[PDB]
Amino acid sequence: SIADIAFIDAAFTRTPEARANYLAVTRAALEGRLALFAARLARHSEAEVAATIDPGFLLDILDLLYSLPAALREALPAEVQARIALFEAFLARYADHPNLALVGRVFREIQAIRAKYSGKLPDEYINTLALIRVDRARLVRDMRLVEETAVIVAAYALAFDPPERHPEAEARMRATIERANALRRAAGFPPSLAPEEGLARARRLAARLRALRAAVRARRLPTGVPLTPEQAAAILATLERLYEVALEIGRAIDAYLAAAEAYAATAAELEANGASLDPAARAALMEATLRARGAVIRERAALLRLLRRFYALVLELDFLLLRAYAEAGHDPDDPALLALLRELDPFNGMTTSELHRRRRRLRDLYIDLVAAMLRGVKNGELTWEEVVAIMDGLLARLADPEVSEEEALVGLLEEIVKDKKPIAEKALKIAVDFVEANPEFLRDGRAGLALIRVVLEYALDDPDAHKELVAFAAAHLPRALDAAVDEIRDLLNDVRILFHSKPSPFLSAEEQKALAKKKLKQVKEILDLMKEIAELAKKIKAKSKDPEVKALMDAMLADIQAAAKEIAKHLEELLKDKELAAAFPELKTLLKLAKEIVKMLE
């Protein structure tokens, strides 16, 4: 986030202008985060919120809260203070909820620190202990991601490296897991992965990757399916790309563990000695601790960009295998190909990490949709020249870490259903099924809204035939709109932050103004989706003869009027800052479009 770049800036440049920028950014980010929480607490029951709300969202609020000096926090306006009290009451109540357990432990540790040390020791020493508790909740989650990623690093090493270098790759793997369990114990947790459980998973995967390469070398897949010379070459190129990214990731993991160990050492020293030091030596040890913390943030961000690249290459390899089965006359949905693709799943059996559980599921959706599009080529419904134009789009949209994987896959649906081709029906079925089975998909608003538009444009032709699709659309639109209004608040608040923010050696002004224009574009795209959906629900309501269909269409038009009003309110509050409004005139075009949506429905 922007708050991380500003924090890095402040902890390394050490200027009054840098801390100033960081404190303003951290305050603005926090105000935005607390507004989203209050909106989410208002839309449902505390029990529903507690079971569905992203834990990381609550960790982000604790992080920003104790990144302020206590003085700045207790000085925040009353509605921010009201939101902080609402937030704290909610965490106190649901600290034991399975969904919130990690955040709950963090909240109880901070409550305990305040009970023990308040008033006796300096408040910004206490804030530093509070941040340390939050960051140790982040190190548990990061240690999950690192334990999983070490299995991929070791697998690609064992599989493609000469057998002489295999012990070394095993030593590294063991060292990594051991370093991770050591870190876990420092923060006060038990060890999660066993150095053998993991080496076992890595050896299995290495066997499969070795097999695939040996077979492709021989113009076939391990299932026996023959390959063309060109496709074999592409598979072998993709495998060498995966091997390369796996080396970069091994290095990034070592960088992350080094930073993490530095932060854990300096923090343990602050907790051990800080109370007894003199003010100057204590201020020096807090400075040291914040600089190590900045290193951890930088090295984590590096590893995650490389992981997004690895994922995109994983999906490209999956495409190549599905295409080969289709050129050989088989159906790309053959149980044998699916078995192969599951054996080559780099995110299997390590079900400890939010990022990889989410990506494993989306991979299944992607395989199912690509299969649909291929079975569609065989039926003459699509051309290979069409498929190869869609796939080049999708794989680039996926490599970019600025596009959500969910919005990328929804684009794949958009391409397949556009021509209202007969394969469209099966594609929608896969998608509608996935969303019912995996309701978290609708945390991404732009994605969800785009799916609803697909379903309605599909059902526009004959509304009454496809009445299940129209019901799915009506049932899921409120959640999609909630997530969309949330995204527009995030995007607009970030725009205001990037305007008042100060050019940094990590954010050029040209990068800040460019990023601002990109976010304002995303806001326009979401308002455009909202309009399109209303146009479609109106047409559906006219054409249709059924009366409860018409009821649902009015329900949807009502939820959309609410959403657009609630969005115009926020745009207006941002237009009160006339310097901002000056710098970005798009903000005015956006409010016009939002109000045109409030009239189309009046």
Short description:
Helices cover 80% and strands 0% of the residues. The protein has 602 residues and is mainly alpha-helical.
Describe this structure in words.
- This protein has helices at residues 2-13, 16-43, 46-52, 55-65, 70-73, 78-93, 101-117, 123-160, 166-187, 195-217, 229-273, 279-327, 335-343, 354-378, 384-399, 405-418, 424-437, 445-460, 467-500, 509-543, 547-575, 578-583, 586-599.
- It is mainly α and 602 residues long.
- Among the domains are: 1-120; 444-602, Glutathione S-transferase Yfyf (Class Pi), Chain A, domain 2 (Up-down Bundle).
- It is classed as de novo protein.
Tell me the helix content.
over 70%
Please report the total strand number as a whole number. Answer: 0
Specify Rg, calculated over alpha carbons.
Answer: 26 Å
CATH architecture of one domain: Up-down Bundle
Strand proportion = under 5%
CATH class of one domain, named: Mainly Alpha
- Looking at the structure, the CATH topology of one domain is Glutathione S-transferase Yfyf (Class Pi), Chain A, domain 2
Give the overall shape.
globular
PDB class: de novo protein
Keywords: P600, DE novo protein
Assembly: monomeric
Entry title: Efficient and scalable protein design using a relaxed sequence space
